[PDB]
């Protein structure tokens, strides 16, 4: 199906403690494969996934150099934002950026994007057209104008359509064995008594991949979506993910409820009661 190449970039100022901390974490779908953390003794781009071993020494050198340049640019950005916003040089601030592109199963571009955030809030973003930018406030407008005169939109678009799309294909080719697999969910249910003749029914889904999954509780064949409690699908540190969803029921009426689990690795939805 569709696949994606995303990068999570964060830059944080820490007044009185030295240089800002810079980071770059890349993902191919729900799999982290590259990383850069300026807080390493000797900052360098490192592989996070096995298959990235298929890249020669020159790859890591260029990515490391590019990453360091990126780090400098953001160090400047944090400085600029203080002026744009007329803020003190003693406070801590955060710049966040998410950049990526997605391709269909045929390898052609579905969509690309790049969005910035300053201290937790929207700053500027490239519109789906990949031609123009949209600013959250007047500060980001200054940026919008600047990039317009410099032709930034056009440059970034070249990256999204070319560089981004071409590197994603390669990565999928090299890690096909890992990025194209399908780990099927193993599910089970736990029971927990509560005050006032009611028990808690928690449904677990484990060791699956990719991350996208659906957990629902039912009664009479109807879904109790709004009365369920659940956590966001999460990584289990081995490339797989897990998730649980619960519902409170009447003691003696457990067998009445069933958990339904739909996943790319489940030819037919799982069904289980307590």
């Amino acid at each position: 199906g569709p696949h994606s190449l995303r990068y999570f970039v964060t830059a944080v100022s820490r007044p009185g403690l030295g240089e800002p901390r810079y980071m770059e974490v890349g993902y191919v779908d729900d799999t982290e494969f590259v990383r850069f953390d300026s807080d390493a003794e000797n900052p360098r781009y490192e592989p996070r996934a096995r298959w990235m071993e298929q890249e020669g020494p020159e790859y890591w050198e260029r990515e490391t150099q590019k990453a360091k340049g990126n780090e400098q640019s953001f160090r400047v950005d944090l400085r600029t934002l203080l002026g744009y916003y007329n803020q003190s040089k003693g406070g801590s601030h955060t710049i966040q950026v998410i950049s990526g592109c997605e391709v269909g199963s045929d390898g052609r571009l579905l969509r690309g994007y790049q969005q910035y955030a300053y201290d937790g809030c929207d700053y500027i973003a490239l519109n789906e057209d990949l031609k123009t930018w949209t600013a959250a406030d007047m500060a980001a407008l200054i940026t919008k104008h600047k990039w317009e005169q410099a032709g930034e939109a056009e440059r970034l678009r070249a990256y999204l359509e070319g560089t981004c799309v071409e590197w994603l294909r390669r990565y999928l080719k090299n890690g096909n064995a890992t990025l194209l697999r399908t780990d099927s969910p193993k599910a089970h249910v736990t029971h927990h008594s509560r005050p006032e003749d009611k028990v808690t029914l928690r449904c677990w889904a484990l060791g699956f991949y990719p991350a996208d999954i659906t957990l629902t509780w039912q009664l009479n064949g109807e879904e109790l979506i709004q009365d369920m409690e659940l956590v966001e699908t999460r990584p289990a540190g081995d490339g797989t993910f897990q998730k649980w969803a619960s519902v409170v029921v009447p003691l003696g009426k457990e067998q009445y409820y069933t958990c339904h689990v739909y996943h790319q690795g489940l030819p037919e939805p799982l069904t289980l009661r307590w």
Partner: peptide, 8 residues
């Protein structure tokens, strides 16, 4: 390969 970022 991540993009090349330039000042805002």
């Amino acid at each position: 390969s991540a993009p090349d970022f330039r000042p805002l």
